[PDB]
What we know:
Keywords: GPI-anchored Protein, Recombinant Vaccine, surface active protein
Oligomer: monomer
PDB class: surface active protein
Helix content: 55-70%
Assembly: monomeric
CATH topology: Glycosylphosphatidylinositol-anchored merozoite surface protein
Structural class: mainly alpha
Entry title: Solution structure of the adhesion protein Bd37 from Babesia divergens
Order of helices and strands: HHHHHHHHH
Name: Glycosylphosphatidylinositol-anchored merozoite surface protein
Number of helices: 9
CATH class: Mainly Alpha
Amino acid sequence: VKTLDVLRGELRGQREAFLSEIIKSDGPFTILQLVGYLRVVDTDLLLKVDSTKVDEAGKKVKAYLEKIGIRGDSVEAALDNLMIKVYEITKGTVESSAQGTDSEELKTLLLKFSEDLKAEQELHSEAKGGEALLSSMKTQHDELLKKFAALTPTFLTSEDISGYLTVPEYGAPMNAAKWKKVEGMIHGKLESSEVPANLKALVAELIELREQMMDLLYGPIGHH
């Protein structure tokens, strides 16, 4: 019969399928697919993150950046900067006046990159469906809160349970990303105190409801 660890194993298969596609295909990494490479490792942190395979895959990302315009940075610098850059674009923060330019092809490629991210986000939060983001976070909280509090002790606060489920604005700083702060506490409690096997299944349900929300907010990856 299936178990919570077999379900985690199936999630790792789905992540590995996108990482395999990253190693088989090192082409035009659009800025949704770029946080896409790191989504593979960041969600895989809930089981185990293989350093060699993430490095080999990240080298494909860096090889694309080199292939299109050789840069001094690293996969570690690019992964941090790109998360906060998508989040900053989503905030559309106010700054002082400035001027500059780029090659017409390079600019056209950045518009293609921006247009890809917009085209998916419009399908997710404008095309008669943005209310589904709010609906999913409310319905998943209200059912999961009953399960997580009926199988005491109550692991987290009411907003820490909703915010793990919500997996909001993927790219936010590590002093703003509430879901990732809760994820560190979830990982730390499992690395420390004893927990019932049925409560661990409820933790796996908390992880799969966030996966459903991550699809309904940011779509699939490695889809075949």
